[PDB]
Design a protein around this nucleic acid. Structure first.
Ligand SMILES: Nc1nc2c(ncn2[C@@H]2O[C@H](COP(=O)(O)OP(=O)(O)OP(=O)(O)O)[C@@H](O)[C@H]2O)c(=O)[nH]1
Ligand SMILES: Nc1ncnc2c1ncn2[C@@H]1O[C@H](COP(=O)(O)OP(=O)(O)OP(=O)(O)O)[C@@H](O)[C@H]1O
Ligand SMILES: [Mg+2]
Ligand SMILES: [Zn+2]
Length: 353
DNA sequence: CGACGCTAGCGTCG
DNA sequence: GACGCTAGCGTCG
């Protein structure tokens, strides 16, 4: 018996006018920005643009509130070392060396000039509407802010792409084999991984973090175990729809419940990483048939619940890293969310309404 | 430039 | 209400 969630999907879906209004300005800022950066004999003249994040993978919710974009530099002969046997972070050992310090590139050193350039470049158009948000320490992305027409943010991430084989941390991860098959799985691994300037502790300046944003986007585009899943000549799965609700449930919790100390740590990547685990858990399209929507979402929420209690949410690409690890997040934070979702699951999801 | 797939929005319904 | 058009954006060359 319908919750009914389908209405919830309808509420969530972006305005066609909304996107077009938002869309055209975003590319315009990025395309111009890209063009000017390429022209200048900066190190970043070589930059190529990669579009990633929710909107582009098409799981954006309510409104085009935010955009994520990646600027990738192809870097050759790269060598790298793990900071402290942490799957996410490495420093790249090593020809433009201005940013480099001590034969190892400094993200902080490298990022700072990049952010500096954008700020300089943004100043040219210098609309009151367009500005660069103040740096947040431990943030690797320069953030554009557009006050026209409405408040919206675009995240620019500097990207170093390596044609090298994926790091050892990766290999156990990404078990799409049952779901998507070895051929597909093997092909994904062949595509290059990316490096971004995030640092684990509490301080660090020259470490980097791996990004598989391009890979995640790819699998989201092609979730189906069948080639035709969600195609015109194929049955429609509800996987993407399941994801939106999950994204929506959490976001509604922060806002509607109201922000709390425990709530802040949790972010949309956790649901997305969690959702993938379920897809691995359940690799058949028949299981995800649209008419079967209601159970799956429940199945989706249940898994998330288990994770919080278990406190184990291994990174999809890196099994070793636990997103839900206590050092990453304290227990009381888990409990509270757990209960609220717990409350939510039993009560028929009023928060959506 | 130019294909096409995807999705929002809407008309028809055999 | 399920189909099935349309328009428009995103994408890889
Ligand atoms: N496109 C992309 N963006 C990333 C990636 N990793 C981190 N970011 C960016 O990092 C920003 C937020 O920083 P987080 O990585 O989430 O770290 P955090 O623990 O939440 O702390 P904050 O930096 O303050 O947000 C986001 O806007 C992301 O765009 C990635 O693999 N791909
Ligand atoms: N904490 C994180 N850890 C690791 N990777 C991340 C993290 N946070 C964000 N990313 C990368 O960034 C991309 C987008 O992250 P971000 O939260 O900024 O936007 P989004 O989740 O895709 O969109 P939305 O606002 O709707 O949730 C993801 O696809 C992922 O690859
Ligand atoms: Mg996003
Ligand atoms: Zn599907």
């Amino acid at each position: 018996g319908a919750w009914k969630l389908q209405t919830v999907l309808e509420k969530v879906r972006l305005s066609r006018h909304e996107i077009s209004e938002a869309a055209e300005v975003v590319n315009w800022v990025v395309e111009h920005l890209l063009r000017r950066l390429q022209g200048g004999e900066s190190e970043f003249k070589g930059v190529a643009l990669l579009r990633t994040g929710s909107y582009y993978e098409r799981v954006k919710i309510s409104a085009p509130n935010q955009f994520n974009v990646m600027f990738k530099l192809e870097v050759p002969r790269i060598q790298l070392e793990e900071y402290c046997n942490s799957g996410a972070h490495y420093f790249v050992k090593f020809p433009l060396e201005q940013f480099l310090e001590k034969e190892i590139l400094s993200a902080s050193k490298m990022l700072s000039k990049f952010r500096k350039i954008i700020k300089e470049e943004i100043k040219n158009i210098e609309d009151t509407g367009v500005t660069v948000e103040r740096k947040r320490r431990g943030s690797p992305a320069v953030t554009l802010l557009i006050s026209k027409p409405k408040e919206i943010s675009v995240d620019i991430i500097l990207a170093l792409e390596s044609k090298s084989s994926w790091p050892a941390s990766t290999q156990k991860g990404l078990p799409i084999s049952q779901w998507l098959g070895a051929k597909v799985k093997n092909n994904l691994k062949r595509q290059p991984f990316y490096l971004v300037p995030k640092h684990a502790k509490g301080f660090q300046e020259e470490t980097w973090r791996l990004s598989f944003s391009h890979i995640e986007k790819d699998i989201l585009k092609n979730h189906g175990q069948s080639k035709t899943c969600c195609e015109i000549d194929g049955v429609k799965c509800c996987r993407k729809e399941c994801l939106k609700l999950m994204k929506y449930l959490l976001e509604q919790l922060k806002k509607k419940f109201g922000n709390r100390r425990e709530l802040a740590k949790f972010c949309s990547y956790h649901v997305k990483t969690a959702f993938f685990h379920v897809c691995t858990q359940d690799p058949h399209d028949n299981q995800w048939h649209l008419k079967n929507l209601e159970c799956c979402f429940d199945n989706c929420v249940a898994y998330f619940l288990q994770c919080l209690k278990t406190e184990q949410l291994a990174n999809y690409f890196i099994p070793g890293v636990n997103l839900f690890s206590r050092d990453l997040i304290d227990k009381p934070s888990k409990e509270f969310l757990s209960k609220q979702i717990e409350y939510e699951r039993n009560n028929g999801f009023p928060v959506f309404w």
